[PDB]
């Protein structure tokens, strides 16, 4: 496992989820109204779940060099407690939400992209503290 | 015929996010490079414009393709070879697709100023390309009549 590659899209994450959190207090009706505001958010929510992906594939090549969906990818983290089983499960659907911001689905629905902010808000820190945890135990093996 | 209904709705769509995009030709690229949330308003309305494109050209080139196969970058050139899209236009617009495949991250990495040259590509080619399209969708309406 190659560190900088993990932490790399760890602290884009967390830039990502950084601006993600200045829309946390946006009202409904503001974010149905607001065309621009929806773009935003749909983005950074695609960004951070593609990066998420992304360190999964890259953690899991590693460990098992057997192929995961996207979803399973998350779940398999949790059974070897990269990720805690309970946020793999939590965290899991993330997968389908970065499908459908990439247009793999049918239309997009505002009302659920702005319930995802708040679960992606509170789900992908956590999702960050348990990997760098992991990360900064195999720099501290190495050293 | 769903097809002319198809490609119309998704003329619409590429108009309201031309739009929106059109706030953005006269931003510097200091400005740009400045600000993520211009960026990120910008890189997804280019996604949503390119995807809508793909979509329509797709349903084009279903009618008159028998099942041969083609890249989203070739769709546009065989539009250009039907005479759908002027050639200058189909050749000019074409790598949009390669754009769109880096905006939902088929591969690579994001330069903004590859993305700020592409909002004022857009601006100039993607109007050309509704008003054209629109121009295909009424021959279409007029050959399913007269068939
Ligand atoms: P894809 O087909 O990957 O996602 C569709 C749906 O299937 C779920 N899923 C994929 N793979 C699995 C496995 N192996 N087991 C169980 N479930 C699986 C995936 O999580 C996804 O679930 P959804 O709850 O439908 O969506 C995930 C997430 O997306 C947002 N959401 C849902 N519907 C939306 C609309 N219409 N617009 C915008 N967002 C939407 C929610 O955040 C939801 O939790
Ligand atoms: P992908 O594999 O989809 O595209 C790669 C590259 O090849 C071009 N291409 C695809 N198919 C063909 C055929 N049949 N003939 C000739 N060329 C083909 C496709 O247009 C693409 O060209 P690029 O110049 O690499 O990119 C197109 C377009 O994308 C933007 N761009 C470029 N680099 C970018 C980065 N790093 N970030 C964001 N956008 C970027 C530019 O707007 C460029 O014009």
């Known amino acids: 496992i190659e560190p900088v590659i993990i932490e790399t899209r760890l602290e884009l994450i967390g830039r990502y989820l950084d601006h993600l959190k200045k829309f946390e207090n946006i009202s409904l009706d503001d974010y149905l109204s607001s065309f621009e505001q929806q773009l ?63 247009h793999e689905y049918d239309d997009i629905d505002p009302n659920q992209v702005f319930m995802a902010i708040s679960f992606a808000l509170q789900q992908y820190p956590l999702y960050v503290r348990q990997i760098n945890s992991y990360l900064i135990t195999l720099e501290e093996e190495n050293d």
């Open 40 to 102: 935003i958010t749909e983005r950074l929510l695609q960004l951070i779940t593609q990066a998420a992906i992304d360190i999964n594939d890259h953690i899991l090549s590693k460990l098992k060099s057997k192929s995961y969906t996207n979803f399973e990818a998350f779940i398999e983290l949790g059974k070897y407690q990269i990720l805690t089983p309970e946020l793999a499960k939590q965290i899991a659907p993330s997968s389908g939400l970065a499908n459908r911001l990439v």
